[PDB]
Symmetry: D2
Subunit: 194 residues, 4 copies
């Protein structure tokens, strides 16, 4: 029974990826171009998310700040989910909704990029992070799922949404991780060739 | 050299120095009781969980790292865990439920009878820490509360076996400075009591 | 639309999909044994410690947060602790001694007989994780190792009661993708076994 | 006996502060001006350190990104000690000595400031962080103790050292924390008046 349940999970994950391969590629490519153009212009990338998505935020920032595959220079990315003093104080002093937006308002420079990760598209703090990136004239790459939630209504024409065609948070995170490896691979290829 | 700046810095140093002098007059008894609660917990194979917000979250992990690595003398690592460092845990709990549960949910899972909670707050009024204390009580843990001002809601929740180290100040930055020194004192007393000398 | 980019993305998706298909053929038995080791530890009031480097450190805290908060079903928080999140602890241990001791020193302090170590490495060759396994053994803990390639030095250290989930791939990013899914499977099996349904 | 030991610690801490008040103020002021000038020119501040010093690094970044005392806008600071994926991968892949320097090379922009914290002045990774800030044309504020170690030999004329007159790490960290509150207070006063 457990073996069957595991297979069923592997299979659902495989199917979700096959469904995502049918619609995500163009958005994944557009998002990598948005990020490469920012990196080429002294810009940096900020990432935020909650739970497994906070793990994706820092997964992305480490691939860039250290490396993805080939040896190359560190690239500028900052995860907004890791400084516990900043996060706890903001949430404590005002509200949890401001933990990312408040850092973006300080760190965001025009032309920088915000990688906003949410499987529901409905996390208040990421919705507010997107508003704050817009206030700093930043472009937004949003990794989402379901119907895109409030995050999708905030996206502007230059922003890019990568909406996983799934309603299951765990499946969604699995594609998000793959999507991030694609972005890291495409950024390296674009900046340093194949 | 600029007028206001050199004056201001001197004024801040003096206020930090004076605050420690007042604290020196009332905190020693509490700092000692608190180190004994911690030492007993450690001897009984228990562990210490710490929590706080902002500068206090910095203190929570400063404490944890002093024990897990070392304070001064070379000795084995001691069991402490700061409840403020796992961003996935913290963000998912706050995002799914409420920021008020970030520490308490971890304590309910991790806390064991006889463990100790180091609850840090300069006002004594942070809801998450207040809920952490209630969770430590529900897990039959003792609480060492580092506070300031009038103790706030944290103070009224403390039980007879708990220990409060209330800094005699209303200024958060002054209270944090004294909390850091108090933590260095607890680490020092814990080594003294556990390994002697 | 650009030639190479759309081709490359498709190629990466396919390689991720194929890797999962190969993993689907060999990992289920191990994933199940590993969930049973974890479930037994949790039932016996033990806890799970997780560690790893880079993407694997992300996985270590993803695992910890799934248990401390929730995976899918509403249920009480479960005891897990990622050994990779406390920066004060990690930096002081690496700075004073060696980066190789960052996990092992925490395990020696925190680990208890019957606890479980989730050791994550795509090569199986990270020294700190290798030393973490040796420390879990010294604390009479069982080890669940998420690896890849040929298992590396981590594989040769495993004992008969330990469980290895070795992804059939040599590519780190592919192995991490399968490690994430494996973790979702363990969380799913842990809830199933602990609360039924 | 324990009461006496505690008093002795409080007293040693008080004395160390009194000794620091005799020599630190000019450096503390110079460091706040260096930081204010960077913030006034779209620059940001990066902080790093180990152990209690990593705690100071993020203490500083939170005071700026959230707030110190008065309500004011978030200021740009990034602690390089908090993203565990970045830190572990760099140390794992190369060596622990590169955990900060590698992030500075990516994130550092000319005119930014590095707050490098070390009670000994001799931590390899902070020594290397200072070299990397110099490569990015950044100024350095170094919080140190003892004789300044390798960090002090790397400082350039525009950099500022705040060397606590103590050899005891715990005393040194106590002054560092006070020094950081001074910097936060001076930055607020300079930027938004008294
Ligand atoms: O993906 P979001 O809708 O932005 O929510 C993220 C987190 O709050 C977590 O929610 C649940 O607890 C789980 O699905 C987690 O895995 C998720 O990270
Ligand atoms: O010390 P508490 O009252 O529990 O509050 C802690 C934090 O929310 C922070 O509040 C303000 O932002 C500042 O005073 C911080 O230094 C403090 O850590
Ligand atoms: O998976 P390991 O062999 O134990 O190594 C983990 C990390 O050091 C990182 O190494 C490289 O930088 C990359 O492949 C990362 O994705 C990986 O986490
Ligand atoms: O202050 P450093 O010389 O840069 O060293 C920092 C850390 O390695 C730690 O060293 C010892 O373990 C203790 O003194 C810690 O408090 C300190 O943070």
């Amino acid at each position: 029974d457990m073996q069957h349940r595991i297979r069923q999970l592997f299979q659902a994950s495989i199917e979700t990826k096959q469904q995502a391969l049918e619609v995500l590629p163009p958005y994944i490519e557009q998002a990598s171009l948005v990020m490469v153009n920012a990196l080429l212009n002294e810009g940096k990338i900020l990432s935020c998310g909650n739970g497994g998505s906070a793990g994706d935020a820092q997964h992305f920032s480490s691939e860039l700040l250290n490396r993805f595959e080939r040896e190359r220079p560190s690239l500028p990315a900052v995860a907004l989910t890791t400084d516990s003093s900043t996060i706890t104080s903001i949430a404590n002093d005002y509200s949890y909704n401001e933990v990312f937006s408040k850092q973006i308002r300080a760190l965001g420079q025009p032309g920088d990029v915000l990688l906003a990760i949410s499987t529901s598209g409905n996390s208040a703090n990421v919705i507010q992070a997107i508003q704050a990136a817009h206030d700093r004239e930043m472009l937004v790459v949003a990794l989402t799922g379901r119907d895109g939630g409030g995050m999708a209504s905030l996206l502007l024409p230059e922003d890019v949404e990568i909406r996983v065609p799934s309603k299951i948070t765990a499946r969604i995170q699995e594609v998000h991780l793959l999507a991030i490896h694609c972005l890291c691979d495409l950024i390296d290829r674009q900046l340093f060739g194949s």
